[PDB]
Ligand binder design. Sequence first.
Ligand SMILES: Nc1nc(=O)c2ncn([C@@H]3O[C@@H]4COP(=O)(O)O[C@H]5[C@@H](O)[C@H](n6cnc7c(N)ncnc76)O[C@@H]5COP(=O)(O)O[C@@H]3[C@@H]4O)c2[nH]1
Ligand SMILES: [Zn+2]
Length: 360
Amino acid sequence: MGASKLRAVLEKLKLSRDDISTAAGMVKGVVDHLLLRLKCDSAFRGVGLLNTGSYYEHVKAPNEFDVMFKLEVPRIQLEEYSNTRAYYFVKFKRNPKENPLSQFLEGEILSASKMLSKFRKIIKEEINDIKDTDVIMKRKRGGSPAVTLLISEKISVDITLALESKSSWPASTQEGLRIQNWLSAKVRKQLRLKPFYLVPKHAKEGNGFQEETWRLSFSHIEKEILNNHGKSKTCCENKEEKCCRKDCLKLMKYLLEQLKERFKDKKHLDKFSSYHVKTAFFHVCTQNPQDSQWDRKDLGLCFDNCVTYFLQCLRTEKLENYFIPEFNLFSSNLIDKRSKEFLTKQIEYERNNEFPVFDE
Ligand SMILES: Nc1nc(=O)c2ncn([C@@H]3O[C@@H]4COP(=O)(O)O[C@H]5[C@@H](O)[C@H](n6cnc7c(N)ncnc76)O[C@@H]5COP(=O)(O)O[C@@H]3[C@@H]4O)c2[nH]1
Ligand SMILES: [Zn+2]
């Protein structure tokens, strides 16, 4: 695929500032309401919106949003669950006083499900009485840490509770975030000085879930490297330094979206998500650390790079969490071989036919 061809695909996907800002305005209204309602509970007194510029997650298009509600909690003490590397039990270093989160304490262990339940119940209670905006809560999605809302039958919002820890990141992330040769060792240090988050997504335990466990999240870091993405500090600030990194990611996401859409009737692509694509993309960024390897005229080659890497990940059934290297997002235990073989074949068909998926 030629570079100009690929950018013509993105150009026709570009949304009008009006349709975007209207969409953003609706979710902000709902979010503002939920935040203040939430503050009426002592346990969520500390809730606040984490890292949101309210830019949508779908390319097409401005109908889906992903928000995290960060909760500042006292010094946290983690205990890794069954060496899963990403899931943890949360305990408090000092709990002699009857904590505000004490109601969610099952033993010395802060229950993810109990918090998630109340969080959800509080939100569901304010959804009936929202002024001027029609809002509905979606069914619980299997295994999701998120409360999903649908605004005006058009806009989906994922609202995810997020415990904030200012402690240093857990050992499982020691070899993660390999950005040294790309964004530099000192950027990695400064990033790792920032807080990490815990969302109420439970580890698998037999036919069910270990309902107390939380999972690590670094969406704030993911946000930072996407918007400050070059080896050069002035990457994408002038004509002579315009790179195609953001375009590649968009095209990879739109490819996955379109395929998921085409084959909704089948079940094969249901477990794949833009998070897989974003992760695959970060790895490619690490493999191609130079801004010259992401030249604007090379969008064609760079996109194929991303496609090819993603394909290798599907075939070998290995896609490392960018922050937690021993967590395999593509293990056969999460996504079975057939689904990955199906996605593999469709992407390959697309590439061999000049991406019919990319035209209207
Ligand atoms: N809004 C939202 N924020 C999250 O952090 C998150 N984590 C999971 N989910 C959704 O819960 C359900 C259970 O999926 P699972 O955990 O088994 O696999 C997930 C998970 O391993 C990984 N993943 C997705 N988002 C994140 C994330 N923010 N951080 C780490 N991993 C993530 O990508 C897989 C599929 O993602 P989605 O299919 O788009 O949404 C999942 C899914 O609907 C999330 N939904
Ligand atoms: Zn750039």
